[PDB]
Design an enzyme around this catalytic site. Structure first.
Site, PDB file in Angstrom:
ATOM      1  N   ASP A   1      -4.034   1.784  -3.222  1.00  0.00           N
ATOM      2  CA  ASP A   1      -4.350   0.381  -3.107  1.00  0.00           C
ATOM      3  C   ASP A   1      -3.593  -0.446  -4.165  1.00  0.00           C
ATOM      4  OD1 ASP A   1      -6.010   0.639  -0.922  1.00  0.00           O
ATOM      5  OD2 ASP A   1      -7.865   0.351  -2.030  1.00  0.00           O
TER       6      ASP A   1
ATOM      7  N   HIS B   1      -8.628   2.896  -3.007  1.00  0.00           N
ATOM      8  CA  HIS B   1      -7.807   4.100  -2.632  1.00  0.00           C
ATOM      9  C   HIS B   1      -6.798   4.277  -3.715  1.00  0.00           C
ATOM     10  CE1 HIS B   1      -8.435   2.673   1.840  1.00  0.00           C
ATOM     11  NE2 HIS B   1      -9.557   3.108   1.291  1.00  0.00           N
TER      12      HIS B   1
ATOM     13  N   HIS C   1       2.914  -5.112   4.310  1.00  0.00           N
ATOM     14  CA  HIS C   1       2.203  -5.527   5.503  1.00  0.00           C
ATOM     15  C   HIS C   1       2.407  -6.969   5.789  1.00  0.00           C
ATOM     16  CE1 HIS C   1      -0.249  -1.828   6.044  1.00  0.00           C
ATOM     17  NE2 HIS C   1      -0.011  -1.696   4.748  1.00  0.00           N
TER      18      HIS C   1
ATOM     19  N   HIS D   1       0.818  -1.243   0.000  1.00  0.00           N
ATOM     20  CA  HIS D   1       0.000   0.000   0.000  1.00  0.00           C
ATOM     21  C   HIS D   1       0.828   1.258   0.000  1.00  0.00           C
ATOM     22  CE1 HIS D   1      -2.772  -2.920   2.103  1.00  0.00           C
ATOM     23  NE2 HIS D   1      -3.130  -2.817   0.840  1.00  0.00           N
TER      24      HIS D   1
ATOM     25  N   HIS E   1      -3.886   4.900   4.724  1.00  0.00           N
ATOM     26  CA  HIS E   1      -3.872   4.701   3.278  1.00  0.00           C
ATOM     27  C   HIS E   1      -3.974   6.040   2.574  1.00  0.00           C
ATOM     28  CE1 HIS E   1      -4.836   0.181   2.685  1.00  0.00           C
ATOM     29  NE2 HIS E   1      -4.321   0.361   3.885  1.00  0.00           N
TER      30      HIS E   1
ATOM     31  N   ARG F   1       2.693  -3.342   9.842  1.00  0.00           N
ATOM     32  CA  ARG F   1       3.530  -2.751   8.848  1.00  0.00           C
ATOM     33  C   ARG F   1       4.914  -3.332   9.062  1.00  0.00           C
ATOM     34  NH1 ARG F   1       1.025   3.529   8.734  1.00  0.00           N
ATOM     35  NH2 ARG F   1      -1.125   2.806   9.015  1.00  0.00           N
TER      36      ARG F   1
ATOM     37  N   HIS G   1       0.692   4.732   1.700  1.00  0.00           N
ATOM     38  CA  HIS G   1       0.123   5.478   2.872  1.00  0.00           C
ATOM     39  C   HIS G   1       0.346   6.954   2.797  1.00  0.00           C
ATOM     40  CE1 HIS G   1      -0.867   1.862   5.461  1.00  0.00           C
ATOM     41  NE2 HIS G   1      -0.265   1.359   4.400  1.00  0.00           N
TER      42      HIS G   1
ATOM     43  N   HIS H   1     -11.811   0.862   0.433  1.00  0.00           N
ATOM     44  CA  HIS H   1     -10.708  -0.010   0.074  1.00  0.00           C
ATOM     45  C   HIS H   1     -11.078  -1.127  -0.967  1.00  0.00           C
ATOM     46  CE1 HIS H   1      -7.010  -2.340   0.497  1.00  0.00           C
ATOM     47  NE2 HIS H   1      -7.799  -3.392   0.616  1.00  0.00           N
TER      48      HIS H   1
END
Lengths: 153, 153
Positions: free
Chosen positions: B83, B80, B120, B46, B63, B143, B48, B71
């Site tokens: 994403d 997003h 992640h 992702h 995000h 994370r 962020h 999402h």
């Protein structure tokens, strides 16, 4: 108002956090924070071109010099965008950075978001150091700690 | 033709280099590199919101979702900006990344230079995990490693 942060890390004890705030897109940028792990004295303090740390601080490339100018101090007309002078470490290795600059930006062509802040071995001589190297990089030495300048809340 | 890079690091063994490339403003961002130190399987990948690493990968925040969407997966219309789905670690913990994305960008409103990439703990279920958290974060866990997206040569 546009905000940025940099976390400085390198191979040894040098570390810290440098905040950037620019409330008007044509006003100056306030740069402040702290660095520890430093030898007493004056340490060159430069925005480098790339936010690339893939093989270390070396990956950051040269100073951020978009106008192909020669190296100066902050107060000079003739200087790179990323010439922010020296920061000074006290006896206990701590540098309290406080700086206002009108050549860097957080937007536009002079934008330093996604580029690298680097703290150097020795004093930036600021173009006034008496040799070739001086007017290119300021003889500030090795790169002790760096990081990529990022967008902050 | 604009290029960025992110070096991924965390408190664990997860390391990686990820390259981004968008040869024209309106076009797709090509993304590729390698991440090691991962458990076999799928892991959320992702963008962020913040390029802030002050207190580790947590400081990156949420995000990157400028359009305030739910999402999903990268192929979804409802997603997003940040994403990017999942990368796949092999049995030896290595994740070969190759991705083309048309939603993220290296310039503009959807610009990701100076923001964070995070990898992640667990698979992103892509909004099809069938609980509340599925459609916020996709359930991808903690994370493991992040880095600020910087300008590259």
């Amino acid at each position: 108002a546009t905000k940025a942060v940099c976390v400085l890390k390198g191979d040894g004890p040098v570390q810290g956090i440098i905040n950037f705030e620019q409330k008007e897109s044509n006003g100056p940028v306030k740069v402040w924070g702290s660095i520890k792990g430093l030898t007493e004295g004056l340490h060159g303090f430069h925005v480098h071109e790339f936010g690339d740390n893939r093989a270390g601080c070396t990956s950051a490339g040269p100073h951020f010099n978009p106008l192909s100018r020669k190296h100066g101090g902050p107060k000079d007309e003739e200087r790179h965008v990323g010439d922010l002078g020296n920061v000074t470490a006290d006896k206990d290795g701590v540098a309290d950075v406080s700086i206002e600059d009108s050549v860097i930006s957080l937007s536009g062509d002079h934008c330093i978001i996604g580029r690298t802040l680097v703290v150097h071995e020795k004093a930036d001589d600021l173009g006034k150091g008496g040799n070739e190297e001086s007017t290119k990089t300021g003889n500030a030495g090795s790169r002790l700690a760096c990081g990529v300048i990022g967008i902050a809340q």
